[PDB]
Symmetry: D2
Subunit: 388 residues, 4 copies
Amino acid sequence: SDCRTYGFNTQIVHAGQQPDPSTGALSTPIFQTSTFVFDSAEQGAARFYTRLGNPTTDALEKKLAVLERGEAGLATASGISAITTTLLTLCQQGDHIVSASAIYGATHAFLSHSMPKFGINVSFVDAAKPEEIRAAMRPETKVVYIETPANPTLSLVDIETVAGIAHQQGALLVVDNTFMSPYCQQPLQLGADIVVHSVTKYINGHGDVIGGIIVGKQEFIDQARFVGLKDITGGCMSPFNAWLTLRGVKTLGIRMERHCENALKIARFLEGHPSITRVYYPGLSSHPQYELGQRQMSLPGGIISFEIAGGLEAGRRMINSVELCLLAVSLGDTETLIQHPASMTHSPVAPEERLKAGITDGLIRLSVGLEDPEDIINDLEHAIRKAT
Amino acid sequence: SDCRTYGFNTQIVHAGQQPDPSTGALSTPIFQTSTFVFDSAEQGAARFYTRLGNPTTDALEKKLAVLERGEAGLATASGISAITTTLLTLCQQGDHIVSASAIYGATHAFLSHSMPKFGINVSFVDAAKPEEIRAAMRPETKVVYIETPANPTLSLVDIETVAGIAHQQGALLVVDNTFMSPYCQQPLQLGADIVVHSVTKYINGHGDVIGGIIVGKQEFIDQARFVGLKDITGGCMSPFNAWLTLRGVKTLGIRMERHCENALKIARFLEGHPSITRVYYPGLSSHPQYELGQRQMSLPGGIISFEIAGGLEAGRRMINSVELCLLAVSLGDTETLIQHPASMTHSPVAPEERLKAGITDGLIRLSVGLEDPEDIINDLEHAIRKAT
Amino acid sequence: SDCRTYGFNTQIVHAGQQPDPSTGALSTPIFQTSTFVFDSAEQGAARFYTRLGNPTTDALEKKLAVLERGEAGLATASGISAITTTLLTLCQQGDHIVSASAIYGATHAFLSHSMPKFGINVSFVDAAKPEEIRAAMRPETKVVYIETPANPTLSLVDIETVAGIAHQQGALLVVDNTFMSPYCQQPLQLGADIVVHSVTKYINGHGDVIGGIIVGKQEFIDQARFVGLKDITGGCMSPFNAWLTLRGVKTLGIRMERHCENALKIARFLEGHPSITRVYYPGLSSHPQYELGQRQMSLPGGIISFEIAGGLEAGRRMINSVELCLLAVSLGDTETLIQHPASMTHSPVAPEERLKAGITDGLIRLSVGLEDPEDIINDLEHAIRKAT
Amino acid sequence: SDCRTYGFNTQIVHAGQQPDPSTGALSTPIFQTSTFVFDSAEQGAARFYTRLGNPTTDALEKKLAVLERGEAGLATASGISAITTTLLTLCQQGDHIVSASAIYGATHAFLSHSMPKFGINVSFVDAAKPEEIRAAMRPETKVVYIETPANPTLSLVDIETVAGIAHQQGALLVVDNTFMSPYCQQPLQLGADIVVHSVTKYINGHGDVIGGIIVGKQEFIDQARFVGLKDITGGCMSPFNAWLTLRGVKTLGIRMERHCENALKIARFLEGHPSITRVYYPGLSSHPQYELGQRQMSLPGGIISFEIAGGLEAGRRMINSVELCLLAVSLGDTETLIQHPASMTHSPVAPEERLKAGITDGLIRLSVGLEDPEDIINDLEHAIRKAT
Ligand SMILES: [Cl-]
Ligand SMILES: [Cl-]
Ligand SMILES: [Cl-]
Ligand SMILES: [Cl-]
Ligand SMILES: [K+]
Ligand SMILES: [K+]
Ligand SMILES: [K+]
Ligand SMILES: [K+]
Ligand code: NA
Ligand code: NA
Ligand code: NA
Ligand code: NA
Ligand code: NA
Ligand code: NA
Ligand code: NA
Ligand code: NA
Ligand code: NA
Ligand code: NA
Ligand code: NA
Ligand code: NA
Ligand code: NA
Ligand code: NA
Ligand code: NA
Ligand code: NA
Ligand code: NA
Ligand code: NA
Ligand code: NA
Ligand code: NA
């Protein structure tokens, strides 16, 4: 049989994995090795595993390729390494990238500062407006880069439409699918060429692995492996991290279902709360791109942003008043995590500059975990009531 | 007390480590986490651990900084990531590097193909001839890059002399100290600015970790961390790999002593063997740079190369006739590893091209392990006798 | 706050765990140590952690105590060690135990052969008939021991009724709650004194840990720790195994929901299949103790047994014809596991003897995993059709 | 080839291990699994791995069997579990054991309190006097149990002589060889039937594993596995712990050499110190059984006890004055560990009772690590000078 024929939950559990032929061990063994040995001179010549590859990591790569409906996968040391290994493989001095402006911080730093120092130019545009992507393309443009949903107000990008534009103008589309996971969105099925993830978030899901994955065509992945990883970034994932990620992803389907069920309940609670001015969540019908979200995403996700009445000090008082939600900058963990960017991460950033980046003084971001939603809601209500 | 005052073996065991203040646990705990939590909005702002840092990995970094007599350390996903994170932090389009030609394969690929595609030019020279380094320097030269001892005939580079030349001409000296480990050579003490290692080899020593380390001034390491890793390569080491490397390095002193004691015995055996045309080992007085080696290295190392009579087919027959030595391309493991590059790794490379790279048809490389030297010698004698 | 006040899913995620005070690390650190260090002679005397205890393992013990509504927990090397550490702590030569006959194999061997060789007598009874328990009690009886549901036809034991009988006659009730997990059954809430689990099954859930847990009163657990583990069995759980079990149990609620949802669908499919003579599942209303199950269990479980038409050879042909279900003797894993005891585990056992133990020639046992139920049903239908 | 023919260091590195046939991985894979899968009904019947066995753990067991020159090995959850699994396998109610009085604390508790409650009687004797062993033997005696060297003054037991006595009187000899490791003493070669270790000490050596090992004849080990572990103690070692122990034992030879070299230097320093009344170390010629030690042990060990002038308060002041040595109750770690039993572990024990157990008020125990011996000596001198 072939796991590509089975249902998505079956694939989550089984794809890329099988009992160890040699021993029958069900769990993928942890091949925590640096060295692989040959039986003869001839076997050595023939191979020239390698250790730009590993059996444990191979299982993870194969699984994620199946889940994203891509040909091949490549695991990395971090989400940022997935992104940079991809882009540094594809681009050289003189090349150009059109990127969404609404992207993860480290990605933005890489694109705005690192790439130009290597002679690779980047144009940032509002990717919610596909015409801005088209207008920014140049003969040199190799890649269009997008993230959807995107921080901090969970705006969307129309993957299929953007793919069509990128392709007509001769560029590849790379999509960061971290926020959704393959359970909720499949960019390759909508025309994207390459998908990257931080597995640090939902794919692993257990808050104990930093890692990334790249999924795409065999021809590209081979280059990302044998040139990108081998020569450029050196960002290979350790076998133990691969094993933990394999373990974490076993429950991806059931986790995403619960994250999203909980998040929808919490989003509705927040939308009904008179101390909350705005709630950003793709599952709410007042989301500006609601219908796009319904076509492109199978679930609205486990992340919510919202604005509390009373600005900076109200936000600070609110996060200082929660008892269950944990103050942290991560997402996709089993625990509910909360942050108030204007006081926590963007505190030294000028207030008017924060505003231009969509970060208002009262904006709170919530990564909804697997706790009872009534407990999360009660904690939020407690903190909001105190803060306002 | 301060471990910088203690003897080198004491430092190997204790530097960068202490019982856990919270629990008393002697072993450094494995902080296998992706998420760190704040107690308040204020604590979050104050920090802005981070997860461009980790307590387990910090211990390793601190330990290696002490052992190399450097200010600070930075762990990475691989030796190649240590090298590229370093060089991509230091260099941008228009910059220049003078490199030894006798360097590790992946490093050579990075320098010869990857760097120029980012507008960074590289001149390769024979670093055993410091005048060639001087002559190749340009106003744009940011870095002189060397490895010593160097493959495949274990030639040396005079670190102190090269440092003086690099510095007079305004460049930094980066030394790959993988071959020796800090137990046997300390490039920073000889004027190098930055040391890199693949900890995959001797520092870990147990053949089960891929990883790298960078050691240098705090100001540089901060840039390598907060720009190089964070933005460019994403090549961060997993906490479990850091913990294993901490564990492996506990025995670095006793391992290096035994590796080198065994290697000297084996080298002398080989030098006395009439079927062996040449033996390359810094501990043999006929080594071309023997006296330099005695000043710069505290021990002659655990690696030997030698040429067997009868060229390509003799080398192939020899490695196919060993019973104890394992056929593998790694080094620094507890097991003795052997390889015959002309049949194993460089088989598709043209014979005359192999020759120019110092790889003769009969060249065998040996990474001497911790077995009884009489057993290793007996195995070699058995295989050599058969092969010739 | 106090996690004993929160909802059960919130407890599953958070109970016994908190961010590391020292570092903020969210994941419980892996305290993989054997040695704990003192700051002074006085601190050493004061303590006399210990290493009959460990911070990682403590977190697991505390969590499971909360989930079972018990005072304290004690982790062990295996489910069988949880059972024997418990019983060998409680009993000495001359004591007596009344046990269900329908119990796990290794437990039965311990009780039938090991205990009597230590002068501890055991009477086996049909625990579905509480009167048989009463009748078997003696002045020497220290413990009544039960498992529910019980192999191989998933019969039940009325915990509350049996607890009342045991207590009136001066004995403790020990319940093996492995099959259900605390998510589905809480024996202490029904009057049991001590609960044991193999965490190897559902609590860990990921098929990669062997381990046990004991939950009960502080006074008893202290004896099980400081006498049972320390002196008698030595069966302590490794910190890494505790960490993995903590990680696995994070998803216990969502896993059990999906296991049971899938199992109910599969059980109904099997009950409608004319090639299947019997289906044993607590969720089917024809189960002999259905109403008891509805009072005592919050969900009917993830395990099903059924009898296929055509006896021994049909069962063999059936398990040889599945493509998705894996042939294995475990349960509680994320993968669906199937076994045919009469051909696989009880093959050398006389056919008439198997019958007395409730193992008919056509009996198949199924541990339902997290795959799509349509895929599991299709695989079963395929195999059944072929086999019959 | 057969590693039983090779030198002891070669065996330490290679015995029980080989590159993974399936993948070539040099490191023994970590088979962190609970479940093993069958390919058919027939394969399932045929096996009936098992999970009273595991490939990683098997490698460790095989290695230790080679090192002790025994037929077979069995890994356990702890040293105490190695001991109790052994003795509870061998003995039943009515049986008798003759034991040394000078044995590890937990062992003593098991023998003095646990065994008699199971109807197994124990006679304690001074095993330095083989005539006391002979005189204590009864028709019921199944086992003579000894430890050598033995706490707290490092007295010895003549293994060969005691084996001869035990055997003539029809009993087995079990030796706890933890203190020495197989590198320094081989009890089976001297006539012992079974050797047990806490691998927590020297065999692992890295202070991060609790575990035990049993080595003996295949027939006995099979019973210890399939009855002792399976039915009685449940004390199985986790695969990860086995892997770590395999990793630790790679350096056993070089570690023991350095421990003992350092300990001899320190013992001589202490013997020359006028504030030190006595020094107990088998390497000092004034040791009461010095010549026996020279015949039975290849090295005098890494442990020293000594008495400081000034009794209880001097001992307390001394351990409170060390800066490098760590206060802990373990031994065999890479770090030097120190303890003062009269103030630390035996503080609540009556002074006259401590005396009868060989624990004087001024007795200090030292587990010598891998630091520079000059640093350890300087630290001891510093503390002794202050304390006296
Ligand atoms: Cl929930
Ligand atoms: Cl050796
Ligand atoms: Cl499902
Ligand atoms: Cl030393
Ligand atoms: K983040
Ligand atoms: K290599
Ligand atoms: K089972
Ligand atoms: K001890
Ligand atoms: Na694989
Ligand atoms: Na995370
Ligand atoms: Na990788
Ligand atoms: Na506001
Ligand atoms: Na819920
Ligand atoms: Na640290
Ligand atoms: Na290696
Ligand atoms: Na790192
Ligand atoms: Na030749
Ligand atoms: Na040797
Ligand atoms: Na804890
Ligand atoms: Na299992
Ligand atoms: Na335990
Ligand atoms: Na039948
Ligand atoms: Na489903
Ligand atoms: Na094995
Ligand atoms: Na220890
Ligand atoms: Na075991
Ligand atoms: Na004294
Ligand atoms: Na020394």
